[PDB]
Design a protein around this nucleic acid. Sequence first.
RNA 1: UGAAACUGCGAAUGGCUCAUUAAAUCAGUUAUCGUUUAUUUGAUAGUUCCUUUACUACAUGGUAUAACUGUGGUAAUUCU
RNA 2: GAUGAUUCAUAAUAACUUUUCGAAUCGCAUGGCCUUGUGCUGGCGAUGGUUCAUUCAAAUUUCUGCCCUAUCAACUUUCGAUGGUAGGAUAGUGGCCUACCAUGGUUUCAACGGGUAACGGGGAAUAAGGGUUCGAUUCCGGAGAGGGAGCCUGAGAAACG
RNA 3: AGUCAAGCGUUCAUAGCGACAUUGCUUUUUGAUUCUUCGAUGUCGGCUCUUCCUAUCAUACCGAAGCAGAAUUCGGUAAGC
RNA 4: AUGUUACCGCAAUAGUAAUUGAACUUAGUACGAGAGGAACAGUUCAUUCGGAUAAUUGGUUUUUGCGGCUGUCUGAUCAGGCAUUGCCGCGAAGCUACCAUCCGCUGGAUUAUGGCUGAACGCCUCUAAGUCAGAAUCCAUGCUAGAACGCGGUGAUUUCU
RNA 5: UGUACAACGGGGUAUUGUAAGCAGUAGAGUAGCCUUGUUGUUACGAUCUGCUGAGAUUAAGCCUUUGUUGUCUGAUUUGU
Lengths: 171, 126
Amino acid sequence: MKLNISYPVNGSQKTFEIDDEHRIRVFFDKRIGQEVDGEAVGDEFKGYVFKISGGNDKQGFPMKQGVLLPTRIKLLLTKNVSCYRPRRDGERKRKSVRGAIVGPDLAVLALVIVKKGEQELEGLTDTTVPKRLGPKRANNIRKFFGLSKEDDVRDFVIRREVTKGEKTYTK
Amino acid sequence: MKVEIDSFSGAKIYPGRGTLFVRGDSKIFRFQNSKSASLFKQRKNPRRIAWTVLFRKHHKKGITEEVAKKRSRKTVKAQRPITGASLDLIKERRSLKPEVRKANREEKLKANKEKKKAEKAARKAE
RNA sequence: UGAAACUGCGAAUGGCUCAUUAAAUCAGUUAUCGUUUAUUUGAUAGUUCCUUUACUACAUGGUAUAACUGUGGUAAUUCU
RNA sequence: GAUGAUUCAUAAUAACUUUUCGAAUCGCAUGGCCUUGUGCUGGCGAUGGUUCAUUCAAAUUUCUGCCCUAUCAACUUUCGAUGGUAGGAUAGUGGCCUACCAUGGUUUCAACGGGUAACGGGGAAUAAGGGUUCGAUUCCGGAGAGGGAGCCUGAGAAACG
RNA sequence: AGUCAAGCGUUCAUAGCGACAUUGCUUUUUGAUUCUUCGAUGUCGGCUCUUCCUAUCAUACCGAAGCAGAAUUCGGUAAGC
RNA sequence: AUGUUACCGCAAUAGUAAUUGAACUUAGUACGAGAGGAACAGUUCAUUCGGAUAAUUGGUUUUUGCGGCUGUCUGAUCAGGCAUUGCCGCGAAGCUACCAUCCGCUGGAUUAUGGCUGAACGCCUCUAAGUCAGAAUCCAUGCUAGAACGCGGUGAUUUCU
RNA sequence: UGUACAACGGGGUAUUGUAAGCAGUAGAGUAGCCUUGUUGUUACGAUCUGCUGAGAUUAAGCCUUUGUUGUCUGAUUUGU
């Protein structure tokens, strides 16, 4: 199996190709949102604790939260719901999915970190990806920065410099 | 071996012990014992049968499993930079926010600037 | 200037066939004082702070989420 | 006030509402009053919005008309057929559907049943006149998307790109 | 079931058959006889169930062929099954 | 009945049992012009028969064990009686089923037949003296019973009766 | 006169399917009360829920006991 682990503050993410079948029997019989032991999967993650975000089983059908069984089932999905995008308003559709309990049928299990332990991780904590966009709203800037009611938000804006030739500009 | 699960009672079926049934729609049932098997052929409902695991979990008996659902008491906790904002300088400008005279002087500059803008525009119109 | 994506419209028109169907469709001729109607077209919301005095920003208020970044999963899907 | 005619339009009392609508939207040009200011006013538009009328529609609906068959003479009503009362549902009337009640409704003036190499009509061929045959087929209205059933979105579908 | 062998078998009596003649066996047929039984031996078939015979259908091992292989025919010990 | 009584044994004699097929491989090989088409060894399974066994599955149910149901009787309830074992569902234990499971031995002499040496018949010949291999055969191994007049080894052998 | 035996008791294992008794702001509904509630109260009412995988049966050819109460010299015959 594989562990797609992520650190959301740093915004970092990495896949780990796992073996040691008894050190993954611990992962067995676990639901989504449940938290299992970092040391049991790996002493590199000793002391750490994750949260089971989701995962893909074989034949690529994802894990949906909330179904509360392990075997795969066919649901009449709709908009505002995982694992189906509608190509028309009103379009419902029957699709097959896998449910919210963990078992041998899975192939990749997606995890997120909630606490950082004592030692350090290569690809998660030493790096940090930036905010791709800056806040486009006045008050979003105002509360994110804490300025005032009247301090001219137009000039506290973010400015992202890029060069066309030698002419550079913030757009 | 495996230790499978009775369709009716929901009981561990150790190897050899018990029967298996294959309905015409290819659904495979298992029965630990002729009690469960015979009841099934009588078309009984396990939620109505009292000694079954299904009745137990539907009538909420032996409910020491669940406790509650947890909730995290915090924010996203990432005031990171936007790759063009210099997070150090970002905190620097947050500290520069008090003594806001800069934006006030910019407004005073832009006020006389708007004055002369309208002035020269009116002049050209005449 | 400007792809993608969100949004808003349209996709119910057109085009094809004549299997069903013998007061049924249909043709002329009536009614809606018995009803819905986007769009068009003409008019049309001084009265919304509810112990309505500090109860509350109105030179104006809150939340994502896509597209995108990267991690990806299936042999295959306008798959996720 | 109108109407052929209304419990019509419309107005006002008394309340209901988990509360509908009453612009936090956008583009150009930027103009005037001075209490000399990011003060106050100001134009040409686009978008959307409660109600009414209109328009493109839609759905029901009045009267008249359809081929061959009686080697089809009675049909409808179990479990809606005909009416009435009340209610639900409807966008609306209405057995459209339900509860109760009356037993009605159609028929030789061809009901009902069968067949149809039957979608209907405007029309087409053929002729002195009368007429006979055809009309899937360019236009109008219907029906369907392999047979049936169901339903979301929407003003509008029982939708099949 | 033997003896003989005119003939059949492409040619050749005998691989396999074998006319005309002739010598035997068995009592599972059916006659012939009338010994026992008429002061009664319960009288056909089937069902059940055991055992015996071999004149071997199959199976074990062999021999012969007009037996290349496959399939078949004749024959031996064999009634264990 | 063999002096009594008990334990462990021998084995005369009698009985006897296992039977057959398929599939894979050998091999599309041998053989055959081609068409077609084998066999021994090996492995996995099955047919028929036998001898046991009840872990599992199925049957049986007077466990009249648990529950339910009708009629009726005990004033009602509780708990029960009767209904030729009242009826139904489940039902252990026990018995049982190719309806379940397990197991079913290897050595010698032989027939038929093929041979070895070898004469009579100075050669030749499986035969006459001698001799080898050879069958679901025969006899032993194994299995059942154990002469109630077949036998062996060992233990203890009575008192103030 | 004993890791003796037996009859009861306990525990286990099994079978069945949630005992009787009490309670309920559960219950199709229906009658009556009034200070007409907001659990209004009372009478009847299969059935439901809680105590309750409870209760019952359990060697009669099941297992096991640190428990209790008991039992343990009657007759006949046999010699190399």
